[PDB]
Amino acid sequence: MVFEKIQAIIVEELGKDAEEVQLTTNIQEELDADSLDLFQIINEIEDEFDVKIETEDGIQTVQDLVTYVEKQQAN
């Protein structure tokens, strides 16, 4: 469900399809995303779930992003 949301943010922010967004794949390389795009996706998930999303420290993959937002959002 969380990934559905993070995916929603990435899909909308990047205008890419949900199927195109892959957990095992890195967005910065897959979609040639820069720190700003990731920054915004994190700003968007921050605005959506408002959870501790550690980024710009090696996190540029849907798996780490989702795992981190989801793990951090957990009680």
Side-chain angles (χ1 to χ4, degrees):
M1 300 296 289
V2 174
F3 63 89
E4 195 180 321
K5 205 75 175 180
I6 291 166
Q7 186 179 58
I9 286 161
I10 295 167
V11 168
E12 179 63 21
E13 185 64 24
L14 292 170
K16 205 79 194 79
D17 300 313
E19 59 179 315
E20 290 297 311
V21 181
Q22 288 179 41
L23 282 75
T24 180
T25 313
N26 43 19
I27 293 167
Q28 62 161 108
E29 286 179 41
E30 183 181 49
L31 293 169
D32 301 313
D34 301 313
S35 63
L36 290 168
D37 289 343
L38 291 167
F39 178 68
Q40 289 292 116
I41 291 165
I42 272 80
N43 280 359
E44 286 293 312
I45 198 71
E46 181 178 0
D47 189 63
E48 193 65 31
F49 289 138
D50 47 283
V51 297
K52 180 178 180 180
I53 315 107
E54 290 172 336
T55 184
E56 299 181 59
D57 302 312
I59 316 304
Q60 302 85 226
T61 306
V62 173
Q63 182 176 324
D64 296 320
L65 233 167
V66 173
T67 299
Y68 274 116
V69 173
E70 190 178 61
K71 182 70 177 180
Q72 275 77 86
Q73 87 170 232
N75 301 315

